[PDB]
Amino acid sequence: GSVYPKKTHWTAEITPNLHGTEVVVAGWVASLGDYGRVKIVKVSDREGGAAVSVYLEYGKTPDHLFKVFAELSREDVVVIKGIVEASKAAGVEIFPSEIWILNKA
């Protein structure tokens, strides 16, 4: 049986030196971006704090996660599990395996 995971990291703890680490973040949707093949949800857990980027990319991100993305609104309360990926530009983002909506705004 499925159960939403326990938060492992505050959004401010998501740093480039966590590249390759599986994390669970929890908070609210700060913003949404839909550019077609790339979609981005930003999650915050403090006011005036980080807004960590969670990216979805067609052909790489599981298609069921795009269905969850379509349900998302700003201020929704979410739990996201994924792998931290440090920016190639060298700042940080999350490649999700799970997106849970705990409540809609």
Binding site: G33, D34, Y35, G36, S53
Partner: protein, 129 residues
């Protein structure tokens, strides 16, 4: 129209893309290379019913209107067919909005996958600008 590399670099500089939102000219040339292969007429249908249009492959869900995409927002306030002209004005204007949306050039998957973190200035090296 299929632009050559340095031809596009000059056009993009003229249209004010160099350092727009902190992105040097090479980023934009590299993005166009891997999004459209420098082809202004490039169009590609996605599985979600949306289509990507032109030199910078702008998507029909949020950004341009192609009259066939459900949930069209048309934030660039432009027909998608206008993004297929040999003149890049319309694509540049819409690209400027897209890159200002809060995620910088991460809006372009080809830029993320082929340009981001590489020596992008190589794409404008040797060009008369």
């Amino acid at each position: 129209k299929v632009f050559g590399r340095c031809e596009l670099a000059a056009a993009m500089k003229r249209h004010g893309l160099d350092n727009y939102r902190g992105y040097s000219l090479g980023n934009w040339v590299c993005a166009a290379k891997f999004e459209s292969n420098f082809n202004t007429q490039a169009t590609n249908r996605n599985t979600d019913g949306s289509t990507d249009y032109g030199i910078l492959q702008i998507n029909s869900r949020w950004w341009c209107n192609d009259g066939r995409t459900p949930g069209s927002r048309n934030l660039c306030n432009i027909p998608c067919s206008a993004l297929l002209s040999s003149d890049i004005t319309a694509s540049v204007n819409c690209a400027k909005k897209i890159v200002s949306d809060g995620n910088g050039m991460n809006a372009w998957v080809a830029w993320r996958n082929r340009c981001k973190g590489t020596d992008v200035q190589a794409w404008i090296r040797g060009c008369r600008l």
